[PDB]
Amino acid sequence: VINTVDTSHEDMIHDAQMDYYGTRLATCSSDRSVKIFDVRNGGQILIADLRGHEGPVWQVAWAHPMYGNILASCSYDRKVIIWREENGTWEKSHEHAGHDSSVNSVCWAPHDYGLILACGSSDGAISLLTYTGEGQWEVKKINNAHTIGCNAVSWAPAVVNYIKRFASGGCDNLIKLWKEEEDGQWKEEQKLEAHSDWVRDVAWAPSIGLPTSTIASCSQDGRVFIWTCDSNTWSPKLLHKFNDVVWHVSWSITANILAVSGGDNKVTLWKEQWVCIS
């Protein structure tokens, strides 16, 4: 169906991620606010309006309800504010400002790994806020992650302890796949370099059990690359060369349909060669 949700924002929207259950929608805009709507049963109810950022908010990401309904937001103010429910109202439970530049991407770790928030900032460093309990977060910043600055971070589904890995896409014209060593430190495992411009979004395809890890990335040049791992070997396959800049890429729940949104103010859905559905 169609659920036209009036954003009621004071500026242009930047992200819109719905909750895990598919009942609540959270959006962010340049007005330095992140108001969380309720879109249950085709409605537009403002559960809570949040204003704690000193600048525009780029991306938001809901957390798994198994660790509670928690929303994290990364803004231009080089600070990441983690919002949590407290007796039915949203409040800023924790704030992280360990980056010297604006944080552009935040994505919660898979529920199997735990409650880890991977923040990718433009300073070139990535920080992972691991929840140690009792309202205490442990930050293991990976300094100098990107040559210029990381613009996208995407976790990978739990595949076999757990070999925690995620894909980072920044302005270094390449994608860095980070692996969590047994000691605890995070080091790059493999570097993927096929884009000719700044990488804007990376989205690891959710794994359903197929022995094939799939990575979808988009860059500033307008090219969308699909990476597959049949080994740690990745063979990119150019999905399409869009006319304008491509902003975000998102996989389906079964990782068969990829949602590609670019600067042409259009949204395209691609299904497997890759053929557009829209």
Partner 1 sequence: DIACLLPVHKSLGELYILNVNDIQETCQKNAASALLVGRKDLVQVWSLATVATDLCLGPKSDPDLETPWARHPFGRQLLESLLAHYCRLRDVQTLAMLCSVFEAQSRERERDQHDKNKRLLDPANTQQFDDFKKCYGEILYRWGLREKRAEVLKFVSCFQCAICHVAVRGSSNFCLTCGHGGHTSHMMEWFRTQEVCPTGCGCHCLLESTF
In the complex, which residues of this chain contact partner 1 (CB under 8 A)? 1, 3, 20-22, 160, 206-211, 252-257, 269, 271, 277
Closer residue to partner 1 in complex, CB, 20/162:
20
CB of residue 1 to partner 1, shortest distance in Å: 5
Q: How far apart are CB 252 and partner 1 at their closest, in Å?
A: 6
Judge residue 176's burial from the number of C-beta atoms within 10 Å of its C-beta, 0-12 exposed, 13-18 middle, 19 or more buried.
buried
Cα separation, 132 vs 61, whole angstroms: 20
State the nearest-atom distance from the C-beta of 277 to partner 1, in Å.
7
Q: What is the nearest approach in angstroms of partner 1 to the Cβ of residue 75?
A: 28
Please identify, using beta-carbon distances, which residue of 183 and 253 lies nearer to partner 1: 253
Q: Give the nearer residue to partner 1 in terms of CB position, either 98 or 206.
A: 206
Alpha-carbon gap, residue 200 to 208, rounded angstroms: 26
Least distance between partner 1 and beta carbon 214 (Å):
11
Query: What residues does 202 pair with on adjacent strands?
Result: 217
What is the distance of C-alpha 251 from the center of its chain? 12
Closer to partner 1 at the Cβ: 241 or 271?
Answer: 271
Residue whose CB is less far from partner 1, 39 or 194: 39
> How far is 208 from 122, CA to CA, in rounded Å?
32
Paired tokens of 179: 């692996």
Alpha-carbon distance of 72 to 117, in angstroms, equals 8
Q: Residues preceding discontinuities in the chain at C–N > 2.5 Å?
A: 160, 230, 272
The two three-digit tokens of residue 102, written as one number? 């604006």
